[PDB]
Amino acid sequence: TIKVFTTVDNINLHTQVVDMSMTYGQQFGPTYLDGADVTKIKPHNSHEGKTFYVLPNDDTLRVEAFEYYHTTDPSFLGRYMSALNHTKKWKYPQVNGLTSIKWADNNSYLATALLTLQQIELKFNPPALQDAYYRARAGEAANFCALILAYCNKTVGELGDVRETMSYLFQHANLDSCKRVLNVVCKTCGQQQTTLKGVEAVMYMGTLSYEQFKKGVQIPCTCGKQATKYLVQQESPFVMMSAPPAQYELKHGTFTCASEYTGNYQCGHYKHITSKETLYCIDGALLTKSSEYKGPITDVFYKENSYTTTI
Numbered sequence: 001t002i003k004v005f006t007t008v009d010n011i012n013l014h015t016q017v018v019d020m021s022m023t024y025g026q027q028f029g030p031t032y033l034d035g036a037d038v039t040k041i042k043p044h045n046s047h048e049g050k051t052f053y054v055l056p057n058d059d060t061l062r063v064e065a066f067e068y069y070h071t072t073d074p075s076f077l078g079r080y081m082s083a084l085n086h087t088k089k090w091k092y093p094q095v096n097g098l099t100s101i102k103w104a105d106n107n108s109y110l111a112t113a114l115l116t117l118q119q120i121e122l123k124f125n126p127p128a129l130q131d132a133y134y135r136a137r138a139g140e141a142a143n144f145c146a147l148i149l150a151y152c153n154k155t156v157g158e159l160g161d162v163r164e165t166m167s168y169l170f171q172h173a174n175l176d177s178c179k180r181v182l183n184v185v186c187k188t189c190g191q192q193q194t195t196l197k198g199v200e201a202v203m204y205m206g207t208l209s210y211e212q213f214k215k216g217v218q219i220p221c222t223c224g225k226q227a228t229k230y231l232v233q234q235e236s237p238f239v240m241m242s243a244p245p246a247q248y249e250l251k252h253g254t255f256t257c258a259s260e261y262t263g264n265y266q267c268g269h270y271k272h273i274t275s276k277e278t279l280y281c282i283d284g285a286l287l288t289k290s291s292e293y294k295g296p297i298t299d300v301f302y303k304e305n306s307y308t309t310t311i
């Protein structure tokens with residue numbers, strides 16, 4: 001036999017002694033080491049003392065798993081480990097003071113998302129995700145990237161939409177204090193206010209321009225007529241404006257960052273535009289810069305705190 005530790009969170013370790021004749025899966029159930037499924041492997045001698053992730057099979061571990069991940073999903077941990085087996089082999093270069101990702105396993109949309117999250121103000125509710133976010137800012141982003149995949153119900157190599165990913169991530173973040181007040185004006189039905197909170201208060205699909213949203217955008221009413229929707233009041237640390245890819249002018253100092261997308265629906269390539277002393281285009285490990293920009297943009301992020309309209 002040998003002595004090992006099992007865990008669901010890598011915080012609360014539970015001591016174990018494994019008979020070196022039986023496979024870990026005989027003893028503990030599905031078992032993992034640094035993201036690698038060891039369920040059908042028998043204890044080795046170098047394994048001595050190491051920590052093994054297991055699935056939550058008693059109530060103590062179900063509660064420790066909810067406390068760290070905010071999940072009751074019994075599949076969650078295996079989806080995290082499947083992803084980590086890849087993300088731990090990715091490279092995370094520093095590019096322009098930001099943790100990026102060298103291209104692999106179709107991960108351009110995760111790189112763009114990772115770069116964006118470093119430039120906006122966000123607190124994740126699950127500890128596991130907040131801790132991995134901190135460790136990623138500091139350059140070690142494998143666990144964060146694996147957790148993003150698991151929390152978005154996405155696998156390595158699958159094609160991802162940045163806006164869909166940020167939306168899923170926002171739903172696991174503390175945006176509950178965030179508020180948006182809209183006013184719609186239809187010539188038939190009249191004028192009507194609406195208040196949005198949470199993730200709906202920070203995302204809009206339809207235009208890339210925050211200014212345009214403040215000035216008003218044409219939408220359909222329930223009258224079968226086109227009303228105008230404008231922003232009355234915004235209370236959040238950022239807003240995300242999206243629209244189907246299209247050519248768009250970006251000027252330094254007027255936005256925080258943007259998603260550039262080139263190619264066909266679903267199988268194109270994301271790049272990240274960020275506004276610093278000049279405009280930087282971060283493409284995984286590649287960096288380019290330009291004083292001006294015109295290109296195909298599909299999301300733009302803007303800093304906010306409190307905005308109130310002038311009617």
Ligand SMILES: Cc1ccc(N2CC(N3CCC(C)(O)CC3)C2)cc1C(=O)NC1(c2ccc3c4c(cccc24)C(=O)N3C)CC1
Nearest residue numbers: 159160161162163164243244245261264265266267268298
């Ligand atoms: C990269 C990518 C990966 C995956 C997906 N999908 C999974 C989605 N699916 C998931 C779950 C759901 C069912 O709930 C909602 C739909 C669809 C989409 C894209 C993608 O290409 N997104 C962009 C884009 C390019 C060109 C576009 C558009 C259009 C509309 C919206 C986006 C878009 C549009 O009209 N054109 C001509 C932004 C780059």
Ligand SMILES: [Cl-]
Nearest residue numbers: 069070071125
């Ligand atoms: Cl929850």
Ligand SMILES: [Cl-]
Nearest residue numbers: 070125126172
């Ligand atoms: Cl959550």
Ligand SMILES: [Cl-]
Nearest residue numbers: 264265266267
């Ligand atoms: Cl194709």
Ligand SMILES: [Zn+2]
Nearest residue numbers: 177178235236
């Ligand atoms: Zn708020």
Ligand SMILES: [Zn+2]
Nearest residue numbers: 186189221223
């Ligand atoms: Zn109306």
Ligand SMILES: [Zn+2]
Nearest residue numbers: 260271281295
């Ligand atoms: Zn570019």
